[PDB]
């Protein structure tokens, strides 16, 4: 959940 | 293919109702039927021999029967 938000942040921009 | 002649009749309508009605506007009363009459006579000129062959085959199926 923390990891997934960091993954979406890296994936977005 | 009657639609061809039907379109032509409609097209003749669309000419004749705006040369018959320059100062008349809109309404029935137009009766210059000559070129649409010519169009349907030319249709009959085309489908005299068509109907001769079709009805000849039909009437010989009625009397003589199917080959």
């Amino acid at each position: 959940p923390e990891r997934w938000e960091i993954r979406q942040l890296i994936a977005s921009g | 293919k009657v639609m061809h002649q039907i379109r032509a009749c409609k097209d003749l309508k669309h000419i004749i109702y705006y040369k018959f009605n320059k100062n008349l506007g809109k309404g029935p009363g137009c009766g210059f039927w000559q070129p649409a009459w010519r169009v349907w006579l030319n249709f009959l000129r085309g489908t005299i021999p068509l109907l001769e062959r079709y009805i000849g085959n039909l009437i010989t199926r009625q009397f003589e029967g199917r080959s």
Binding site: - | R53, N57, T60, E64, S67
Partner: protein, 73 residues
């Protein structure tokens, strides 16, 4: 067994014995009524590089393999 192969053909003797009915067909109308007559340094890091008809079978042909590689992607 209501559907069967063909043993022999419907012979034209059976069509020559029948008397005709006159059904003027749409194609036997007179047309072509005249017979014509004749007269009488940057690439040295990799592992590969330049530094280092007809057959009769149709399924086995070249064109059919070109076809199937064209139309199955």
């Amino acid at each position: 067994t209501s559907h069967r192969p063909q043993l022999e053909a419907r012979s034209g003797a059976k069509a020559a014995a029948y008397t005709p009915t006159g059904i003027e067909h749409a194609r036997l109308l007179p047309g072509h009524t005249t017979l014509k007559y004749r007269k009488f340094s940057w690439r040295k890091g990799t592992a590969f590089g330049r530094h280092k008809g007809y057959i009769n079978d149709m399924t086995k042909s070249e064109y059919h393999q070109e076809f199937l590689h064209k139309h199955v992607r």
